[PDB]
Write a protein that binds this ligand. Structure first.
Ligand SMILES: [Mg+2]
Ligand SMILES: [Mg+2]
Ligand SMILES: [Mg+2]
Ligand SMILES: [Mg+2]
Ligand SMILES: [Mg+2]
Ligand SMILES: [Mg+2]
Ligand SMILES: [Mg+2]
Ligand SMILES: [Mg+2]
Ligand SMILES: [Mg+2]
Ligand SMILES: [Mg+2]
Ligand SMILES: [Mg+2]
Ligand SMILES: [Mg+2]
Ligand SMILES: [Mg+2]
Ligand SMILES: [Mg+2]
Ligand SMILES: [Mg+2]
Ligand SMILES: [Mg+2]
Ligand SMILES: [Mg+2]
Ligand SMILES: [Mg+2]
Ligand SMILES: [Mg+2]
Ligand SMILES: [Mg+2]
Ligand SMILES: [Mg+2]
Ligand SMILES: [Mg+2]
Ligand SMILES: [Mg+2]
Ligand SMILES: [Mg+2]
Ligand SMILES: [Mg+2]
Ligand SMILES: [Mg+2]
Ligand SMILES: [Mg+2]
Ligand SMILES: [Mg+2]
Ligand SMILES: [Mg+2]
Ligand SMILES: [Mg+2]
Ligand SMILES: [Mg+2]
Ligand SMILES: [Mg+2]
Ligand SMILES: [Mg+2]
Ligand SMILES: [Mg+2]
Ligand SMILES: [Mg+2]
Ligand SMILES: [Mg+2]
Ligand SMILES: [Mg+2]
Ligand SMILES: [Mg+2]
Ligand SMILES: [Mg+2]
Ligand SMILES: [Mg+2]
Ligand SMILES: [Mg+2]
Ligand SMILES: [Zn+2]
Lengths: 155, 97, 127, 97, 60, 83, 116, 23
RNA sequence: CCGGGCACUCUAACGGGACUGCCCGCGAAAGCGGGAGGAAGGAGGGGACGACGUCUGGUCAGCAUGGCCCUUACGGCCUGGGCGACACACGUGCUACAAUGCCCACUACAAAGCGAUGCCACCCGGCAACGGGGAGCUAAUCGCAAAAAGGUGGGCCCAGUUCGGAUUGGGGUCUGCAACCCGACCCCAUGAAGCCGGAAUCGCUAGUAAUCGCGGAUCAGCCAUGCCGCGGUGAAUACG
């Protein structure tokens, strides 16, 4: 806003891993304040990535998070009489937000029928290099490299 | 579509068609005239022709008065044209670096 | 012998009684895990003593009234954090920095006329 | 040996519950202190304006405050100076057993 | 047509249903409270003057 | 519809002129404002004028229009379409 | 054309299937399977043929269905439209029948909007 | 959903009772 | 539940409490940033409260009131109709298009209010709306009352469907002198459009938005999906 930079809310760590990042993902899953549902979907998914991939779910989750984080993005700025898609670096706060946002959104694009399944498989593919979530991070990075010429317009 | 209200006053369907034909001058600018609304009224000195129109580039609000109802209608369109032509061209001004 | 705190949150008031023992916890004539059965938020109601190691050291007698489950849960967190301080004054530090001692004032904001809720405003056509 | 007191203003209500507790207290013997029953609130919300302006209101309330007193050890000595009870106008007393 | 209507509301009606409330202060037919017998406009007028026992502006 | 415990409602002032016509060798045309009255079988075969707010409409009662109200047959709104 | 003249879906439970019949809803699905003692959760592909005609028999003899029901509903709308009562007029014009406002909506009875 | 009278949720929405929401 | 008690919760009246008062630092000062203590920190959150004036703003139909106009009528009573019409058009909302869902059975956890031709426990009849009995409560006592989302278990398996519940046929209930126009509700059957919406556009910065139910005024009944309130669950983001 106009007066001051806003203060980033601190999330409570989650009672099943102690992670604030795990909490943020739960919130992004949440619809209509149904946090009990939202928590159950992540933990249900956490078991599914255990059954299909024998290693730490938390490790799978945080690796997929790092994979979807966009390092550069384009942000429009009209110069004269043309809108120039300026390439800007993403602050760590915004990286996290976009990753968790794209993770869920790309997850709910899947064909699998149960939410916990869609959340599980997207995180497995994104722990690797696949998935529509990682595609978004890559597309955004590609479009920022596309416009490196306008990088002096940064603010 | 276009709506016409005759407040505390009765008008004919012919009068309503004249209004629609007169507002048709605004079609010149080839921009969407979104739910245009005209209000004809009667005051002790003359008629008042109000209008509210939204376009993709902004809104138009104008009021016309005159003893003759058609003149008040025409004065309204004149005030509405000057606003539309401002909405359609004001952005072109700050184009040169 | 017996230790007590008063816990409040939103519209829930929880009275908690700490007696030493193996760890059993009962809320309103039910076992803890039965009252909050299927609630993920429950375990946070025992966090103050996990912060001062009294996890299995106490039994818990707990009453509860008003509000809803999670409000009642957060009320417990304050209640048992209240009791551990009267149980030992030096328990404040390493419990107060964990925030567990403060009372959460965030409550339902009143509905105002002209709005649909506290702040949600009616839709209108400025056009 | 019960007395309950109802009034719209709580300042007179509490004073009129003290001058009963105080009364038969020293008059022998036991008086169970004035217990404030929860207040019944009767709400009134109206539009400030006489015509339209639906989104502007003013709230009024009419609170019916309540008090209970138990003159526990009666002794009809007390049941006399209570017959001449100088209570204000705003309060209403009920006597039951 | 109001004065006759103010009198016809007092007159007990040929059927129990035809009975309706009016404002004992101004005759207003709509928004009549039964507790006071007043409309919303008179309710606020008397309350503001202090002539409604107990009634005060409520804020919370 | 009306409770079955209650009766089949007729305004009694309309029911009367039905039976006096029945018990004498009917019929005269009945004018009425009793739109609310049911068309009881004793009426079958008469022609009764129903007030719709403006006109008394001659409505010939037949056998298949009995469990009905008189208003249903003298409609109140004149409407012929638009344009 | 199994039961009753409607080839009800297999793959689905009996209570669910019998709803795919003009005249049989969720309510009458419970009534048919209790009165013939059939597990209401059995797929139509798994009904013993004894069960089928047992289910078929009760259904067709108890209730009016398909054509006879449809002819009757029409006959009632027809008689209302012939005896010239108010509801009949509403069926005459295709307007709504149960007192609803027509200044807006009523699109189910009127159909998609006709421009002017 | 809430607009369906023949379900529990519909009778809750209307504030009524019956076979699909008993009392 | 009784004995017992007012601890606790509470209820409701009166107090205390926060002042940049204390500390570090910048500053001429006013203040600003950070720290501790503290339930609360820099207006603690929300309310009530709206300057001289503006819109020849709104209301002669709430009321008042100048002036003009009507006087077997532009006054008054009634019955019936209309205010609910329907080729269309716009504004506000409700329910949705489904699996983070729908259905059934079982099991929790509120707040604020209302209630003596009122609120109705409990029993019986009816699939039910409801009806007949009948206790309690001038109500922190008796009652409306069950809160719902949630939790447990079971079904549905991606289909215009066990999504959605419009429309219509038929059968009833209740209020009311009277439910044709023109009431609400229940039951059987019917089971529409709708597969997330063009140009355009609204709200919201935290217990907020979103979502879930509860109450009241008006009120015989109700066309309330409205309005004024009440709590439950409970986010995202603010570089600028
Ligand atoms: Mg999202
Ligand atoms: Mg995407
Ligand atoms: Mg028009
Ligand atoms: Mg010109
Ligand atoms: Mg309180
Ligand atoms: Mg658990
Ligand atoms: Mg709320
Ligand atoms: Mg507005
Ligand atoms: Mg509004
Ligand atoms: Mg007149
Ligand atoms: Mg007058
Ligand atoms: Mg009335
Ligand atoms: Mg009235
Ligand atoms: Mg069917
Ligand atoms: Mg209707
Ligand atoms: Mg919904
Ligand atoms: Mg359904
Ligand atoms: Mg005390
Ligand atoms: Mg400061
Ligand atoms: Mg001030
Ligand atoms: Mg006047
Ligand atoms: Mg005047
Ligand atoms: Mg003069
Ligand atoms: Mg009349
Ligand atoms: Mg009428
Ligand atoms: Mg109207
Ligand atoms: Mg209508
Ligand atoms: Mg038009
Ligand atoms: Mg609505
Ligand atoms: Mg909605
Ligand atoms: Mg599908
Ligand atoms: Mg279909
Ligand atoms: Mg279709
Ligand atoms: Mg269906
Ligand atoms: Mg019917
Ligand atoms: Mg009606
Ligand atoms: Mg949706
Ligand atoms: Mg757009
Ligand atoms: Mg703000
Ligand atoms: Mg409600
Ligand atoms: Mg009512
Ligand atoms: Zn008045």
């Amino acid at each position: 806003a106009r007066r001051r930079r806003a203060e980033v809310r601190q999330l409570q760590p989650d009672l099943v891993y102690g992670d604030v990042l795990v909490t943020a993902f739960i919130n992004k899953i949440m619809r209509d304040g149904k946090k009990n549902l939202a928590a159950r979907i992540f933990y249900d998914a956490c078991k599914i990535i255990q059954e299909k991939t024998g290693q730490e779910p938390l490790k799978v989750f945080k690796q997929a998070v790092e994979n979807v984080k966009p390092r550069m993005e384009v942000r429009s700025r009209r110069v004269g009489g043309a809108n120039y898609q300026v390439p800007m670096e993403v602050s760590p706060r915004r990286q996290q937000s976009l990753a968790l946002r794209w993770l869920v959104q790309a997850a709910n694009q899947r064909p699998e029928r149960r939410a916990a399944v869609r959340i599980a498989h997207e995180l497995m593919d994104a722990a690797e290099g696949k998935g529509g979530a990682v595609k978004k991070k890559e597309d955004v990075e590609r479009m920022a490299e596309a416009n490196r010429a306008y990088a002096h317009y940064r603010w | 579509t276009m709506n016409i209200t005759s407040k505390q006053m009765e008008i004919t369907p012919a009068i309503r068609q004249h209004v629609a034909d007169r507002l048709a001058k605004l079609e010149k600018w080839q921009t969407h005239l979104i739910n245009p609304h005209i209000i004809l009224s009667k005051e002790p000195q003359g008629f008042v022709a109000d209008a509210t129109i939204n376009t993709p580039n902004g809104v138009l609000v104008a009021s016309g008065k005159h003893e003759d109802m058609y003149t008040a209608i025409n004065e309204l369109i004149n005030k509405l044209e000057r606003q539309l032509n401002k909405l359609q061209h004001k952005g072109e001004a700050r184009r040169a670096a | 012998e017996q230790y007590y705190g008063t816990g409040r949150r939103k519209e829930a008031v929880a009275r908690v009684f700490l007696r030493p023992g193996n760890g059993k916890v009962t809320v309103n004539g039910q076992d803890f895990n039965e009252y909050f059965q299927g609630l993920v938020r429950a375990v946070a109601a025992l966090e103050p003593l996990r912060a001062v190691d009294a996890l299995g050291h106490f039994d818990a007698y707990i009453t509860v009234r008003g509000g809803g489950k999670s409000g009642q849960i957060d009320a417990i967190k304050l209640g048992i954090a209240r009791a551990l301080v009267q149980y030992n004054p030096d328990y404040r530090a390493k419990l107060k920095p964990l925030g567990f001692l403060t009372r959460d004032a965030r409550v339902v904001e009143r509905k105002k006329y002209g709005k649909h809720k506290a702040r949600r405003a009616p839709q209108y056509s400025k056009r | 040996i019960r007395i309950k007191l109802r009034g719209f203003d709580h300042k007179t209500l509490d004073a009129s519950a003290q001058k009963i507790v105080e009364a038969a207290r020293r008059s022998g013997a036991q008086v169970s202190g004035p217990i404030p029953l929860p207040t019944r609130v009767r709400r009134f919300t109206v539009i400030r304006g006489p015509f339209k302006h639906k989104d502007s209101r003013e709230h009024f309330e009419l609170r019916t405050h309540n008090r209970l007193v138990d003159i526990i050890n009666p002794n009809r000595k007390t049941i006399e100076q209570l017959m001449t009870l100088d209570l204000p106008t705003g309060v209403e007393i009920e006597i039951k057993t | 047509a109001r004065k006759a209507l103010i009198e016809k509301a007092k007159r007990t009606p040929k059927f129990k249903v035809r009975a309706y409330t009016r404002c004992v202060r101004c005759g207003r037919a709509r928004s009549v409270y039964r507790f006071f017998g007043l409309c919303r406009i008179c309710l606020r007028e008397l309350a503001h003057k202090g002539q409604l026992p107990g009634v005060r502006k409520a804020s919370w | 519809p009306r409770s079955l415990k209650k009766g089949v409602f007729v305004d009694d002032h309309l029911l009367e002129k039905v039976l006096e016509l029945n018990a004498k060798g009917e019929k005269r045309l009945i004018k009425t404002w009793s739109r609310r009255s049911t068309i009881v079988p004793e009426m079958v075969g008469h022609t009764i004028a129903v007030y719709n707010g403006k006109q008394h409409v001659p409505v010939y009662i037949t056998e298949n229009m009995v469990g009905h109200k008189l208003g249903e047959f003298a409609p109140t709104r004149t409407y012929r379409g638009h344009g | 054309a199994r039961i009753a003249g409607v080839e009800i879906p297999r793959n689905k439970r009996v209570d669910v299937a019998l709803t795919y019949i003009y005249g049989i809803g969720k309510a009458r699905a419970k009534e048919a399977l209790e009165k013939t003692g059939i597990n209401p959760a059995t797929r139509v592909k798994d009904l013993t043929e004894a069960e089928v005609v047992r289910l078929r028999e009760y259904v067709e003899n108890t209730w009016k269905l398909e054509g006879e029901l449809r002819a009757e509903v029409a006959a009632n709308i027809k008689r209302l439209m012939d005896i010239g009562c108010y509801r009949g007029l509403r069926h005459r014009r295709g307007l709504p029948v149960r007192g609803q406002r027509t200044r807006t909506n009523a699109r189910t009875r009127k159909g998609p909007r006709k421009t002017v | 959903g809430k607009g369906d009278r023949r379900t529990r949720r519909g009778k809750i929405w209307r504030g009524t009772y019956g076979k699909y929401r008993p009392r």
